[PDB]
């Protein structure tokens, strides 16, 4: 039970040995002291006699109730399941430290006195936004970028893995990171790699579902999200396509455009309120950064901004090398011809072309991939 | 896996030993050639400390172990050539060749004869080749040899030389933290005979390296926090010459010799002081050493600094007499009053606006409102209206206490305290004059000046025919002379307690006053006290007023000595019936202020744990627990947690009278830091009333709830207590307790000192002037007699937290430092980190922080002390272009 | 060396400790059970003296009182109403109509009075704790700090100068300026320093799903505020709770206007709140409603502007005084290099310079690091700033 953390010698030094011997002697003496009374003046079993008495005191059925208010001198107002509430007392074996407003408590059947307190039962939301397993392979699968990878590592991994560099110079790590660029260039992929490598709990949510269909539901959802992220542990919060709330409008929204503003104000508070934030990291990503509110991106809320440019031809060759690593590729094909098939093709077109060529070869019950397959695949995927 | 072909080590180095039985005879050349080739091959393959799993060191015992069994013992014709290549090579693998209990069978290869200079091929190895074998030899074989047969065979003659060569070799290759591994073999070798081991190692360490000394010193003091009685007496005397011979500190000696002053011998302290006076070159180091030598680490040192050149250097003691005291008073007046502190804040109870939504007893607490916040020359003119009006109406004891409180108001004064006292002294009252004299004795506390040793207080004493003005004439003088060992006041006060008069309380307080002055010699006081106790307590069975007062003087006269001979003499001197034997557990433990006596700790409870306590020896177990509170003030941060766990699981959880009445009085002795663990354990035991037990006891617990000074943010909690004290816990017994607890938090203001541990772990007296408060607050219902007076200034051993500054000859520089957390770093790496709080940087001489270490910058290098002293000189130098 | 001994002595002592703890009792997985050494008191007396001498004592709400010798009318929210009387232990004075009381379960007679509803979602708004900033960390705007201090905290500390002089101090205050300037941080410092309540409210929390809800929460907020003697309310991001009354065409943004009207009414008219001081801070004050900005509700209008020149050097000194830096760097030049900027950008400058020093290998930064930090976070991240369009408050 955390008796002594000072074992910093961590060796065969006489200091650690003497400390351990003294700890053993103290434990033995206290064990003798705590056993002598059970040998000389037992007066009860005290292992199951007290338990039997307690079980006799509480009835065999016990109901659940909601606390509403508690007085210090061991009583409170408890609302029954139907709704009518009483002024019952509190027993002594209830460990009055989990007594909080809103927690389900176990009441007696006859006099409704509080006899126990009950643990809760998770939430539906937590499963919805809790990432369980690492998706796929780490930064060795990316290629091409190699520049902002170090920036992301500096922001999220390094403060956790080596929290000693910062303390020597006495600075706080940069707080926020946002990723912008044209569509289909590898932002969510970098997020997946970070999720695989990291050790903290990872929470993901898309921006398109921050807008609800009633009044005042959006701020509620935001508050619950950061409450969950706070109450676990060091964690990472990932929000994707934020601009989706400012671009598309839905008639299912009960309000107009002002409830969007209310949700925005709530989010701004949560990022930089006057409460103690704790230990939470935020990652944001979008492809239309010229529309969202500049008050949301000021320094102190988001400190790093990383641009993802279009791939270059060296990176194009590297990507083609990556995506046909395990393909039984025939010797006739050449990647150079495919490199300038389109002037400004992005990362996703490479994978699309490769997969479509694979499917086309799969139709003819074959194993190798020929030139005409690639030639038809590019027309199928690009020119509609 | 692949085997064979490349597996040449399991073939040639296995067939040569296999044919060694056939090559032993009729083959003289091969017997040496193959032996040398195996030795050289194994040595070359064992020279690198990366391939631990050698192809030869482990593949040889599979079949060559039986060969070696038939080689060394079964040859009977050993020569002068084969043995050097045989024993030196069979001693390397044999530690791991056999099973786990191999330590007892090292004499079949290596202890027979050491071949030459085996260290030649063991110099490149650290803890693998033979220094592990050396530690194996020293662990059991040398241990069993030296337990009773120190004079023995070769296992003691040249083994010491080999141990010395191994220890020297340890700090040769890498000089890593393995230097701390050197004592592991040094302590294991001749444990109790550590004196000659350290004497041999001192010359080696002196010529080893200068830098490699300070770390070893630190490790030494780390192993000085606890040791066996003989081991302590040996190590604490052996570590003395380290900073003088090898290192040239010349300033950390006296500060770090408090562990070697009382425990070793007072003559060692005298000779250390003489050596410090001998090295008078710095003429600054000496000032820093002598600054903290009267009320900080020890006292009664103004009897050795009166040599022939008392001009500026040897005359410095005179400035330590009172000039430094006046300088400290001026520092308090300038750096505290002029910065933040007003003259009279007096408003902690005047924040009762929130509470909303007449007895004179509370007026006593009003005095506590004035005195506590008006410390350090908080003199108030016409702000004592309450005391002036109520000193002549009621509460004779309370009025005496209020009169005495003016002395605590004027703390550490020599200028005009008596002049201010004279305003109210001439009143011809039964209690005004006594309280005024107690305040006067408080005022000159620590000054030890020629204010009134036998002039003022003795004038009131010689008329010892009054209830007060005769009792209230010895506490102040004793407090002002607590740190001195002058025998004139001793001979003057001896007839006071030897008067055999009807003044019971006066003799009791005389015992307390006289005990807190001397701690060493003068057995005549012991004899007089013991004979008065024999002729008083024997023919009576009254209350414990004598019990808590007479033996306390003896304990103070026998405090701080681990020899235990004094305890044996005291115990056997006063052998009597158990009620008469109330002092059996007082003097025995009083000599155990700070030490490691886990055996004694468990034997304390072995005699009687509970025994069902049939209302027979309640006070016996009470005092036994009270004395069991010891060893927790400076347990080196180890025993305290176990002790608090034991108290929680044993006393409070189940008990009869010890657990439910005074079990929490331990926390006051435990520590005054303040941790949420106790800050919640105490509230859990205090918020609930539980009128079932002697309610007053719980009240006493509240009196020690805020024993921790240094105010913090949970103070509002105590205000909440006031709410439950409004209706419940009737004020007639707890109004003074709640008020004094409330304003004790900020009673220090920003100046605090009530922990009794300075520098590293040297307590530094204090106990003498602290213990009486705890040993007198056993029963709080006795406050009526003089509860106001006793508390009013029992904790007069307040030294302040103001320490770091400049103290330069001109004292021009104010402060250029940087505060941070504690700085103790284990030798995991030679580069060390210790403070995890570099976030703060201040340049003021304000509060120094309780768990706080302060460093410097701007190329100062701190060439004065660099270790400890709380009065850093801040020498300036710029030898770094 | 003797690892096989020390390791086993540790493991065996750990097992002995676990065994003795199990002997004391920590097993038999609990569903809300206290340690057996703590509830041993509830063994003989509480079982038979805290069970029968006490009863459930239903909670009811009184309606009115028939006069003289009294009969009362009782209401409960699922059972019926009743006509009842008191007991011998309750005086007829402290039973004013409109307060919850305790009633027996069989004879139905009144026992004890009770406090009113507080609505837990409003109970949570009390700060109950304090942050760790201080006035010493808000350098650059001393005038505004002094102006606010002589309203929020000085009258409570010394409420004797004003009474003698006959002046009634102002009650409200507003703080406005461009983003990243120091409003919320100044509020945190105030919350840390004070001693009364500090009830924090975010504007966006007052939006509710149903009709006629936000007004209720405002009512209970001011009721709980009046319960104490004297304490403070903080309103953050007002510009989300009410702009102006403009109703046209189809009724839109109408219920929020009702909430704003209730907030206005609670501050003025027919015995105002008395000893309650409010404090609101906003971002774009050009949209606030004219009825709200009238003095008597918002006596002071402190403005936070971009630091001029001394503010920049002072902020640099505050934010860089706890790091390992070279001995001869001059911050005045850095102040001159960033004309119009806020404290947030200066904090970012310091952190980025530290990161540049960590980047390669060093342990102490140099002036080149600060120059690169300024030339990257001020001049390259300039396509993403708010200050050009919020200095016109639009
Ligand atoms: N730099 C790259 N390295 C490797 N694969 C890439 C790269 N860029 C794109 N791809 C491929 O394109 C796919 C698209 O990736 P992803 O959808 O994560 O990109 P994105 O630009 O973040 O998308 P969006 O903007 O639409 O959210 C990846 O799964 C991968 O197969
Ligand atoms: N005068 C100042 N002194 C010290 N630090 C300052 C000052 N002004 C701003 N800062 C720093 O810059 C940041 C300002 O954030 P703050 O929460 O105070 O802004 P705000 O006024 O609430 O902004 P917004 O209305 O955009 O939410 C904090 O990191 C704070 O430390
Ligand atoms: Mg994406
Ligand atoms: Mg803000």
UniProtKB/Swiss-Prot annotation, chain A:
The modification N6-acetyllysine is found at residue 213. It is found in: Cytoplasm; Nucleus; Membrane. It is a lipid-anchor. It comes from Homo sapiens (Human). Component of the 19S proteasome regulatory particle complex. The 26S proteasome consists of a 20S core particle (CP) and two 19S regulatory subunits (RP). The regulatory particle is made of a lid composed of 9 subunits, a base containing 6 ATPases including PSMC1 and few additional components. Interacts with SCA7. Interacts with NGLY1. Interacts with PAAF1. GO terms for molecular function: ATP binding; ATP hydrolysis activity; proteasome-activating activity; RNA binding. This is 26S proteasome regulatory subunit 4. Its main location: cytoplasm. Keywords: Acetylation, ATP-binding, Cytoplasm, Deafness, Intellectual disability, Isopeptide bond, Lipoprotein, Membrane, Myristate, Nucleotide-binding, Nucleus, Phosphoprotein, Proteasome, Ubl conjugation. The keyword Membrane applies. Residues 39-59 are annotated as: Disordered. GO terms for cellular component: cytosol; membrane; nucleoplasm; nucleus; proteasome accessory complex; proteasome complex; proteasome regulatory particle, base subcomplex.
UniProtKB/Swiss-Prot annotation, chain B:
It comes from the Eukaryota. The keyword Repeat applies. Found in skeletal muscle, liver, heart, brain, kidney, pancreas, lung and placenta. The modification Phosphothreonine is found at residue 24. Keywords: Acetylation, Phosphoprotein, Proteasome, Repeat. Gene3D superfamilies: Leucine-rich Repeat Variant (1.25.10.10). Residues 24-52, 615-635 have a biased composition (Basic and acidic residues). Residues 10-21 have a biased composition (Low complexity). This is 26S proteasome non-ATPase regulatory subunit 2. It comes from Homo sapiens (Human).
UniProtKB/Swiss-Prot annotation, chain C:
The modification N6-acetyllysine is found at residues 77, 383. The keyword Ubl conjugation applies. GO terms for molecular function: ATP binding; ATP hydrolysis activity; proteasome-activating activity. Its main location: cytoplasm. ATP binds at residues 177-184. One of its GO terms (cellular component) is proteasome complex. Gene3D superfamilies: 1.10.8.60, Nucleic acid-binding proteins, P-loop containing nucleotide triphosphate hydrolases. InterPro entries: 26S_Proteasome_ATPase (IPR050221), AAA+_ATPase (IPR003593), AAA_lid_3 (IPR041569), ATPase_AAA_core (IPR003959), ATPase_AAA_CS (IPR003960), NA-bd_OB-fold (IPR012340), P-loop_NTPase (IPR027417), PRS7-like_OB (IPR048723). Monoubiquitinated by RNF181. Phosphorylated. Dephosphorylated by UBLCP1 which impairs PSMC2 ATPase activity and disrupts 26S proteasome assembly. The keyword ATP-binding applies. SMART domains: AAA. This is 26S proteasome regulatory subunit 7. It comes from Homo sapiens.
């Amino acid at each position: 039970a955390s008796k002594l953390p000072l074992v910093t010698p961590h060796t065969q030094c006489r200091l650690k040995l003497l400390k351990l011997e003294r700890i053993k002697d103290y434990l033995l003496m206290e064990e003798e002291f705590i056993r002598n009374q059970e040998q000389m003046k037992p007066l009860e079993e005290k292992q199951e006699e007290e338990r039997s008495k307690v079980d006799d005191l509480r009835g065999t059925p016990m109901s659940v109730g909601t606390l509403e208010e508690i007085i210090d001198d061991n009583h409170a107002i408890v609302s029954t399941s139907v709704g009518s509430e009483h002024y019952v007392s509190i027993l002594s074996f209830v460990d009055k430290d989990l007594l909080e407003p809103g927690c389900s408590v176990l009441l007696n059947h006859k006099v409704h006195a509080v006899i126990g307190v009950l643990m809760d039962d998770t939430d539906p939301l937590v499963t919805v936004m809790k990432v369980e397993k690492a998706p796929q392979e780490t930064y060795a699968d990316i290629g091409g970028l190699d520049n902002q990878i170090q920036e992301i590592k500096e922001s999220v991994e390094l403060p956790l893995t080596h929290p000693e560099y910062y303390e020597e110079m006495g600075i706080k790590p940069p707080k926020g990171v946002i990723l912008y660029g044209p569509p289909g260039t590898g932002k969510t992929l970098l997020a997946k790699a970070v999720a695989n490598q990291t050790s903290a709990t990872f929470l993901r949510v898309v921006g398109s579902e921050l807008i609800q269909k009633y009044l005042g539901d959006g701020p509620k959802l935001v508050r619950e999200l950061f409450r969950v992220a706070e109450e676990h542990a060091p964690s990472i919060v990932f929000i994707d396509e934020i601009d989706a709330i400012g671009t598309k409008r839905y008639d299912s929204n009960s309000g107009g455009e002002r409830e969007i503003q209310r949700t925005m104000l709530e989010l701004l508070n949560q990022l930089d309120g006057f409460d103690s934030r704790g230990d939470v990291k935020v990652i944001m990503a979008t492809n239309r950064i010229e529309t969202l509110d500049p008050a949301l991106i000021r320094p102190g809320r988001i400190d790093r901004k990383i641009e993802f440019p279009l791939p270059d031809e060296k990176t194009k060759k590297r990507i083609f090398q990556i995506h046909t690593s395990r393909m039984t590729l025939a010797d006739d094909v050449t990647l150079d011809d495919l490199i300038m098939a389109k002037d400004d093709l992005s990362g996703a077109d490479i994978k699309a072309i490769c997969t479509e060529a694979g499917l086309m070869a799969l139709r003819e019950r074959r194993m190798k991939v020929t030139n005409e397959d690639f030639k038809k695949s590019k027309e199928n995927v690009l020119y509609k | 896996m692949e085997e064979g072909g490349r597996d040449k080590a399991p073939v040639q180095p296995q067939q040569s030993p296999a044919a060694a039985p056939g090559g032993t005879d009729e083959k003289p050349s091969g017997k040496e050639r193959r032996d040398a080739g195996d030795k050289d091959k194994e040595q070359e393959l064992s020279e690198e400390d990366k391939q631990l799993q050698d192809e030869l060191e482990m593949l040889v015992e599979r079949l060559g172990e039986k060969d070696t069994s038939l080689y060394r013992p079964a040859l009977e014709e050993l020569r002068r050539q084969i043995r050097s290549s045989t024993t030196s090579m069979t001693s390397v693998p044999k530690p791991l060749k056999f099973l786990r209990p191999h330590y007892g069978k090292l004499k079949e290869i290596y202890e027979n004869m050491a071949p030459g200079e085996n260290k030649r091929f063991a110099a490149d190895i650290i803890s693998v080749l033979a220094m592990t074998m050396s530690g194996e030899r020293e662990c059991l074989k040398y241990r069993l040899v030296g337990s009773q047969e120190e004079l023995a065979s070769w296992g003691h003659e040249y083994v010491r030389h080999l141990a010395g060569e191994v220890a020297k070799e340890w700090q040769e290759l890498d000089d890593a933290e393995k230097v701390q591994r050197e004592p592991l073999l040094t302590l294991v070798k001749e444990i109790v005979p550590y004196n000659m081991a350290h004497n041999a190692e001192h010359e080696a360490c002196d010529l080893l390296m200068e830098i490699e000394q300070v770390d070893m010193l630190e490790k030494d003091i780390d192993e000085n926090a606890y040791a066996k009685v003989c081991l302590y007496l040996t190590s604490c005397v052996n570590y003395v010459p380290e900073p003088e011979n090898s290192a040239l500190l010349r300033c950390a000696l006296g500060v770090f010799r408090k562990f070697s002053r009382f425990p070793e011998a007072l003559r060692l302290a005298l000779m250390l002081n003489d050596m410090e006076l001998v090295e008078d070159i710095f003429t600054s180091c000496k000032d820093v050493v002598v600054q903290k030598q009267m009320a900080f680490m020890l006292g009664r040192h103004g009897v050795f600094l009166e040599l022939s050149e008392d001009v500026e250097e040897y005359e410095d003691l005179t400035e330590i007499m009172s000039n430094v005291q006046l300088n400290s008073n001026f520092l308090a007046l300038a750096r505290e009053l002029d910065i933040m502190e007003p003259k009279v804040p007096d408003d902690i109870y005047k924040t009762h606006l929130e509470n909303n939504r007449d007895s004179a007893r509370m007026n006593l607490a009003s005095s506590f409102v004035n005195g506590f916040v008006n410390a350090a020359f908080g003199q108030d003119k016409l702000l004592t209206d309450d005391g002036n009006k109520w000193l002549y109406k009621n509460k004779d004891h309370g009025m005496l206490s209020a009169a005495a409180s003016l002395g605590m108001i004027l703390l550490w004064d020599v200028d005009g305290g008596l002049t201010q006292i004279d305003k109210y002294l001439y009143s011809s009252e039964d209690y005004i004059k006594s309280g005024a004299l107690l305040a006067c004795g408080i005022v000159n506390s620590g000054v030890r000046n020629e204010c009134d040793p036998a002039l003022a207080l003795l004038s009131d004493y010689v008329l010892h025919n009054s209830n007060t003005m005769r009792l209230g004439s010895i506490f102040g003088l004793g407090l002002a002379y607590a740190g001195s060992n002058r025998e004139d006041v001793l001979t003057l006060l001896l007839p006071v307690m030897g008067d055999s008069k009807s003044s019971m309380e006066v003799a009791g307080v005389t015992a307390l006053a006289c005990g807190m002055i001397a701690v060493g010699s003068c057995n005549g006081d012991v004899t007089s006290t013991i004979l008065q106790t024999i002729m008083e307590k024997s023919e009576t069975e009254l209350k414990d007023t004598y019990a808590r007062w007479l033996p306390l003087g003896l304990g103070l006269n026998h405090l701080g000595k681990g020899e235990a001979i004094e305890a044996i003499l005291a115990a056997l001197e006063v052998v009597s019936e158990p009620f008469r034997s109330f002092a059996n557990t007082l003097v025995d433990v009083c000599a155990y202020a700070g030490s490691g006596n886990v055996l004694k700790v468990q034997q304390l409870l072995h005699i009687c744990s509970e025994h069902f306590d049939s209302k027979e020896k309640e006070e016996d177990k009470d005092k036994k627990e009270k004395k069991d509170k010891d060893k927790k003030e400076a347990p080196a941060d180890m025993g305290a947690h176990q002790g608090v766990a034991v108290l929680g699981i044993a006393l409070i959880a189940m008990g009869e009278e010890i657990g439910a009445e005074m079990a929490l009085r331990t926390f006051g002795h435990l520590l005054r830091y303040g941790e949420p663990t106790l800050r919640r354990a105490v509230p859990l035991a205090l918020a609930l009333i539980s009128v079932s037990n002697p309610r007053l006891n719980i009240l006493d617990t509240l009196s020690k709830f805020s024993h921790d000074a240094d105010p913090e943010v949970s103070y509002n909690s105590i205000f909440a207590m006031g709410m439950v004290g409004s209706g419940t816990n009737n004020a007639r017994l707890a109004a003074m307790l709640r008020q004094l607890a409330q304003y004790h938090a900020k009673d220090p203001n920003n100046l605090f000192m009530v922990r009794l541990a300075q520098g590293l772990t040297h307590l530094g007296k204090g106990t003498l002037t602290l213990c009486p408060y705890h040993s007198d607050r056993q029963l709080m219902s006795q406050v009526a007699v003089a509860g106001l007076l006793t508390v009013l200034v029992s904790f007069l051993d307040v030294r302040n937290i103001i320490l770091g500054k400049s103290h330069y000859v001109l004292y021009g520089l104010v402060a250029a430092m940087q505060p941070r957390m504690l700085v103790t770093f284990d030798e995991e790496l030679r580069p060390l980190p210790v403070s995890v709080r570099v976030g703060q940087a201040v340049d003021v001489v304000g509060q120094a922080g309780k768990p706080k270490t302060i460093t410097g910058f701007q190329t100062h290098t701190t060439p004065v002390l660099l270790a400890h002293g709380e009065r850093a000189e801040l020498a300036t130098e710029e030898f770094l272009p | 060396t003797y690892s096989r001994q020390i390791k086993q002595v540790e493991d065996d002592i750990q097992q002995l400790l676990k065994k003795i703890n199990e002997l004391t009792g920590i097993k038999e997985s609990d569903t809300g059970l206290a340690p057996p050494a703590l509830w041993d008191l509830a063994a003989d007396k509480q079982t038979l003296q805290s069970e029968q001498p006490l009863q459930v004592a239903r909670c009811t709400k009184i309606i009115n009182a028939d006069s003289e010798d009294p009969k009362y009318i009782i209401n409960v929210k699922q059972f019926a109403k009743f006509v009842v009387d008191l007991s011998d232990q309750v005086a007829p004075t402290d039973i004013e109509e409109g307060m919850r009381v305790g009633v027996d379960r069989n004879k139905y007679q009144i026992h004890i009075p009770l406090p009113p509803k507080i609505d837990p979602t409003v109970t949570m708004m009390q700060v109950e704790e304090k942050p760790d900033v201080t006035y010493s960390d808000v350098g650059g705007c001393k005038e505004q700090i002094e102006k606010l201090r002589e309203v929020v905290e000085t009258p409570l500390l010394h409420p004797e100068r004003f009474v003698n002089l006959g002046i009634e101090p102002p009650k409200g205050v507003l703080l406005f300026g461009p983003p990243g300037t120091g409003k919320t941080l100044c509020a945190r410092a105030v919350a840390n320093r004070t001693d009364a309540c500090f009830i924090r409210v975010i504007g966006s929390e007052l939006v509710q799903k149903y009709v006629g809800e936000g007004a209720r929460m405002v009512r209970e907020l001011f009721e709980m505020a009046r319960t104490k003697k004297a304490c403070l309310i903080f309103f953050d991001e007002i510009d989300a709770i009410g702009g102006a009354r403009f109703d046209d065409g189809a009724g839109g943004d109408n219920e929020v206007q009702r909430t704003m009207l209730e907030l206005i009414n609670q501050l003025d008219g027919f015995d105002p709140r008395g000893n309650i001081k409010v404090l609101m801070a906003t971002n774009r004050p050009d949209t606030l409603d004219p009825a709200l900005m009238r003095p008597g509700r918002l006596d002071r209008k402190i403005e936070f502007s971009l630091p001029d020149l001394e503010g920049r050097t002072h902020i640099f000194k505050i934010h860089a005084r706890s790091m390992s830096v070279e001995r001869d760097i001059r911050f005045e030049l850095l102040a001159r290099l960033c004309p119009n900027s806020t404290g947030a950008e200066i904090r970012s400058v310091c952190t980025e310079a530290g990161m540049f020093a960590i980047r390669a290998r060093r342990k102490i930064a140099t002036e080149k690091d600060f120059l690169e930090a300024v030339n990257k976070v001020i001049k390259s991240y300039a396509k993403f700033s708010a200050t050009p369009r919020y200095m016109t408050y639009n």
